[PDB]
Design an enzyme around this catalytic site. Structure first.
Site, mmCIF file in Angstrom:
data_model
loop_
_atom_site.group_PDB
_atom_site.id
_atom_site.type_symbol
_atom_site.label_atom_id
_atom_site.label_comp_id
_atom_site.label_asym_id
_atom_site.label_seq_id
_atom_site.Cartn_x
_atom_site.Cartn_y
_atom_site.Cartn_z
ATOM 1 N N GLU A 12 8.555 -13.218 8.767
ATOM 2 C CA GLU A 12 8.093 -13.212 10.151
ATOM 3 C C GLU A 12 7.390 -14.521 10.492
ATOM 4 O O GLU A 12 7.530 -15.039 11.599
ATOM 5 C CB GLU A 12 7.150 -12.035 10.419
ATOM 6 C CG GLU A 12 7.827 -10.671 10.451
ATOM 7 C CD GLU A 12 6.974 -9.617 11.138
ATOM 8 O OE1 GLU A 12 5.758 -9.550 10.855
ATOM 9 O OE2 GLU A 12 7.518 -8.854 11.964
ATOM 10 N N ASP A 31 -5.134 -0.139 3.240
ATOM 11 C CA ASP A 31 -4.674 -0.944 2.114
ATOM 12 C C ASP A 31 -5.482 -0.751 0.836
ATOM 13 O O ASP A 31 -5.085 -1.238 -0.218
ATOM 14 C CB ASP A 31 -4.679 -2.424 2.497
ATOM 15 C CG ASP A 31 -3.469 -2.815 3.325
ATOM 16 O OD1 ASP A 31 -2.728 -1.909 3.763
ATOM 17 O OD2 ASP A 31 -3.264 -4.028 3.545
ATOM 18 N N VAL A 55 -20.122 -5.823 4.199
ATOM 19 C CA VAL A 55 -20.339 -4.971 3.033
ATOM 20 C C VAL A 55 -20.347 -5.806 1.756
ATOM 21 O O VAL A 55 -19.500 -6.678 1.573
ATOM 22 C CB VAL A 55 -19.258 -3.871 2.926
ATOM 23 C CG1 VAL A 55 -19.457 -3.035 1.670
ATOM 24 C CG2 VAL A 55 -19.273 -2.988 4.166
HETATM 25 C C1 FAD Z 1 1.728 -11.066 9.502
HETATM 26 C C2 FAD Z 1 1.423 -9.642 8.941
HETATM 27 C C3 FAD Z 1 2.351 -8.825 9.594
HETATM 28 C C4 FAD Z 1 2.370 -7.432 9.326
HETATM 29 N N1 FAD Z 1 3.346 -6.547 10.015
HETATM 30 C C5 FAD Z 1 3.358 -5.148 9.745
HETATM 31 C C6 FAD Z 1 4.336 -4.257 10.436
HETATM 32 O O1 FAD Z 1 5.085 -4.695 11.190
HETATM 33 N N2 FAD Z 1 4.336 -2.858 10.154
HETATM 34 C C7 FAD Z 1 3.381 -2.307 9.196
HETATM 35 O O2 FAD Z 1 3.373 -1.097 8.949
HETATM 36 N N3 FAD Z 1 2.430 -3.195 8.530
HETATM 37 C C8 FAD Z 1 2.428 -4.596 8.810
HETATM 38 N N4 FAD Z 1 1.478 -5.460 8.139
HETATM 39 C C9 FAD Z 1 0.510 -4.884 7.164
HETATM 40 C C10 FAD Z 1 -0.707 -4.332 7.931
HETATM 41 O O3 FAD Z 1 -1.239 -5.339 8.736
HETATM 42 C C11 FAD Z 1 -1.747 -3.893 6.936
HETATM 43 O O4 FAD Z 1 -1.198 -2.924 6.094
HETATM 44 C C12 FAD Z 1 -2.947 -3.312 7.688
HETATM 45 O O5 FAD Z 1 -3.702 -4.338 8.197
HETATM 46 C C13 FAD Z 1 -3.802 -2.474 6.716
HETATM 47 O O6 FAD Z 1 -4.789 -1.778 7.456
HETATM 48 P P1 FAD Z 1 -6.297 -1.767 6.896
HETATM 49 O O7 FAD Z 1 -7.206 -1.119 7.898
HETATM 50 O O8 FAD Z 1 -6.351 -1.000 5.571
HETATM 51 O O9 FAD Z 1 -6.736 -3.251 6.615
HETATM 52 P P2 FAD Z 1 -7.152 -4.311 7.720
HETATM 53 O O10 FAD Z 1 -6.232 -4.241 8.898
HETATM 54 O O11 FAD Z 1 -7.079 -5.675 7.128
HETATM 55 O O12 FAD Z 1 -8.664 -4.007 8.208
HETATM 56 C C14 FAD Z 1 -9.761 -4.435 7.399
HETATM 57 C C15 FAD Z 1 -11.045 -4.455 8.304
HETATM 58 O O13 FAD Z 1 -12.103 -4.388 7.569
HETATM 59 C C16 FAD Z 1 -12.941 -5.736 7.784
HETATM 60 N N5 FAD Z 1 -13.495 -6.113 6.534
HETATM 61 C C17 FAD Z 1 -12.829 -6.567 5.440
HETATM 62 N N6 FAD Z 1 -13.740 -6.806 4.458
HETATM 63 C C18 FAD Z 1 -14.965 -6.496 4.949
HETATM 64 C C19 FAD Z 1 -16.225 -6.550 4.381
HETATM 65 N N7 FAD Z 1 -16.714 -6.949 3.069
HETATM 66 N N8 FAD Z 1 -17.306 -6.176 5.100
HETATM 67 C C20 FAD Z 1 -17.155 -5.744 6.392
HETATM 68 N N9 FAD Z 1 -15.911 -5.689 6.955
HETATM 69 C C21 FAD Z 1 -14.815 -6.066 6.231
HETATM 70 C C22 FAD Z 1 -12.083 -6.606 8.196
HETATM 71 O O14 FAD Z 1 -12.758 -7.684 9.043
HETATM 72 C C23 FAD Z 1 -11.123 -5.780 9.048
HETATM 73 O O15 FAD Z 1 -11.627 -5.580 10.322
HETATM 74 C C24 FAD Z 1 1.467 -6.887 8.417
HETATM 75 C C25 FAD Z 1 0.537 -7.710 7.761
HETATM 76 C C26 FAD Z 1 0.516 -9.086 8.024
HETATM 77 C C27 FAD Z 1 -0.470 -10.106 7.356
#
Ligand code: FAD
Ligand code: FAD
Lengths: 394, 394
Positions: free
Chosen positions: B167, B297, B79
């Protein structure tokens, strides 16, 4: 009790040390073995861990496990200089005096003053260096998926199409499928380029064996640039000379296998050398020194049949050590020494893990046959220095 | 027939996509799922492959294996921008129109304009990024044996002592014994330094859990620098502020876990944002847009009971996806929507592979108990998106 000091626990030094161990009784002489590491590495196998096709521990063994501490005092230190007049060896953390000296410090890379080569290219000549190469390459591949336009990450330039270069690109070729799978890499984007200044691949070998090697490696995607000298090296790649014009190869990894010389400590210590090597007397002694013996890659032997030097090989290094051990024992006992005569058997070059080329018994060998023969020959050295136990270990 | 477009196959997007899949018939709406990779990665586990304690393939799954191709059209692309006026999404390799939009592009690193941080520090936020970190660190350790005075090779600086940083250093500490043996490194020379600007490790958590965490990690040799902000970052290390004075930490590896923001595409597309995130309405919609939903997020939720924002978590991201899928189905079918109401369960922070801290149910948990509880909780997500088959796989 005379003091025998052996510098370098490589093929020449280890064999010499173990020979003296087997030939001399206790208290006949002091034997000190100096090595910068507490381990002896199997230099002829180093291309495998460099490509990550074999773990590096498979290519080294603890020195203390090989020697008799009651007969040989092992000193872990780095040789800095040799004082011939005082008969003293200077180390980084001390000094040693000798009545007899055995120099087996091995080779160092020869880059012929080519700009950037010493600083930005890698060498396959120790356990440390091959782990560095291995992890460097894996690092480049890891970076590629995030930057798919940077195919230079996937480009590896190997300078010199000699014995070492050919075996290494063979290992790299076998490694690529697993490596690409690990890092989501399109295998078709990978480039392994063997660059050679000389006008023939493996210059000096039998043409039939060479063409087979090129065909096999070529089939595995290895590119050959022959009659093509490297003009300079950068962390971005190399500049090569093509048809009287400069051409740049963008490559994140450059490995130099295009030349070696005798360890510079030898020449810097005032010995007369040719490419760092000493043209020793018939008893492998440095000329003008009845008490200094030179073995392995620091020693130069001329084939009187064709006035050509023997190449720096492990095979002749081993024969050096056996002869020096025999002659030192004789000198200690006031006997006469026996002149060295090399017996050159067959050598097999690996072409990855499942293919190889060489001469064995006097006959050309190929494929699985050659590949197993190489392994057996290498096993023989392990048996020589560590008996059946070392063979059984790996 | 409405076109539903989902941007990002993360926790928010995948759950939303699978929810719509389960709720809607084959002819009620077109569903398009956009993701830059063909795989969905388990973001909460990424700290493990970053430290090399778990293979990265354990932290991702093929998207095609999760969805129904007859119900959802998957598009592998990146995107670039969102056109609210035209209701059009611009990709690197095409463009898409929508009647309803679901934004789940996740977070991007926030370095707060700290000099050199963006360019020279690493982030843990994808499969690509953790493989890069993993191989970077191994590369540094590989270089050390050849240059044993460069102890900065063995120094790893982790910026930010929040959930992720803690972690990660836990995983690194467990990794060190094997890592040091692999590269002949004296383990006592290794430094893992967690640097935090706030005056307490894990600021905002229960002090009892925090003290336990510091004790456990401290015992494993992890250093904590608190009340200490990173002023600038270089490939040589970081400059930090100690008692209002500059002090340098030489370190070949700097990992930033000190802040995140909503994906910049959201802000760049003209949406009103706070730290890159959209303060959505009670139905998780972007204000002024009845047809655009924000999940994970990219969404900002305020707890109305105490007026404090919910942190960007996977747990709430999952709940976002479920609510949006339910509400979208209602909108398509003309029913009434249900206001989002978060149910925040317990979260356990790992302290290496054999230790952990957290709240579960209503009681504080420690050690092996906490460790197993975290694994079971994570397993629950795998079942949610992939059933028993995916669970049995990992
Ligand atoms: C080490 C680590 C440990 C964590 N442990 C916990 C826990 O124990 N408990 C908890 O509740 N939370 C935890 N979190 C936080 C949690 O991982 C995030 O809050 C979660 O990933 C958010 O979900 P999301 O779908 O909004 O984002 P994301 O999981 O990051 O998903 C984003 C998706 O969109 C894709 N994407 C991004 N930009 C683009 C683009 N321009 N074009 C096309 N695709 C794109 C990405 O490739 C990805 O697939 C942890 C985070 C980290 C880094
Ligand atoms: C990939 C590769 C494949 C090869 N395959 C074959 C083959 O198949 N057949 C064959 O005959 N030859 C082969 N060779 C060549 C063979 O390995 C060398 O000729 C052999 O190592 C030379 O023996 P050496 O004892 O003189 O030197 P080395 O084996 O290099 O031993 C030198 C020792 O001295 C130590 N040392 C060096 N400098 C110092 C210092 N200042 N202070 C203290 N210690 C020091 C080193 O740590 C080392 O232990 C191959 C070489 C390479 C790189």
């Amino acid at each position: 009790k005379p003091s025998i000091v052996i510098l370098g626990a490589g093929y020449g030094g280890i064999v010499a040390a173990l020979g003296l161990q087997k030939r001399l009784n206790y208290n006949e002489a002091d034997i000190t073995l100096v090595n910068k590491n507490d381990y002896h590495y199997i230099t002829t196998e180093l291309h495998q861990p460099a490509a990550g096709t074999m773990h590096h521990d498979q290519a080294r063994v603890g020195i203390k496990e090989l020697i008799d501490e009651k007969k040989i005092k092992f000193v872990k230190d780095t040789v800095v200089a040799i004082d011939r007049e005082q008969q003293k060896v200077t180390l980084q953390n001390g000094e040693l005096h000798y009545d007899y000296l055995v120099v087996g410090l091995g080779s160092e890379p020869e880059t012929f003053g080519i700009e950037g080569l010493r600083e930005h290219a890698f060498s396959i000549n120790s356990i440390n260096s091959v782990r560095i190469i291995r992890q460097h390459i894996e690092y480049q591949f890891a970076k590629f998926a995030a930057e798919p336009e940077r195919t230079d990450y996937l480009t590896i330039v190997v300078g010199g199409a000699g014995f070492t270069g050919i075996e290494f690109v063979g290992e790299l070729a076998d490694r690529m499928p697993e490596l690409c799978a690990e890092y989501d890499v399109d295998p078709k984007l990978v480039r392994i380029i063997n660059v050679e200044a000389a006008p023939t691949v493996l210059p000096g070998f039998d043409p039939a064996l060479v063409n087979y090697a090129m065909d096999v490696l070529g089939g595995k995607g290895v590119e050959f640039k022959i009659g093509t000298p490297i003009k300079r090296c950068t962390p971005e790649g190399v500049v090569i000379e093509v048809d009287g014009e400069e051409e740049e190869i963008k490559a994140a990894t450059v490995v130099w296998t295009g030349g070696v010389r005798g360890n510079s400590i030898v020449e810097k210590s005032g010995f007369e050398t040719m490419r760092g090597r000493i043209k020793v007397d018939p008893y492998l002694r440095a000329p003008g020194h009845e008490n200094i013996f030179i073995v392995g890659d620091c020693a130069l032997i001329i084939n009187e049949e064709n006035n050509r030097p023997y190449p720096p090989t492990a095979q002749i290094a081993i024969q050096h050590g056996e002869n020096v051990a025999a002659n030192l024992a004789a000198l200690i006992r006031g006997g006469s020494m026996t002149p060295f005569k090399p017996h050159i058997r067959g050598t097999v070059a690996s072409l990855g893990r499942n293919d190889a080329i060489g001469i064995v018994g006097g006959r050309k060998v190929y494929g699985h046959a050659a590949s197993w023969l190489k392994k057996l020959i290498d096993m023989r050295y392990l048996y020589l220095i560590g008996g059946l136990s070392l063979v059984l270990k790996k």
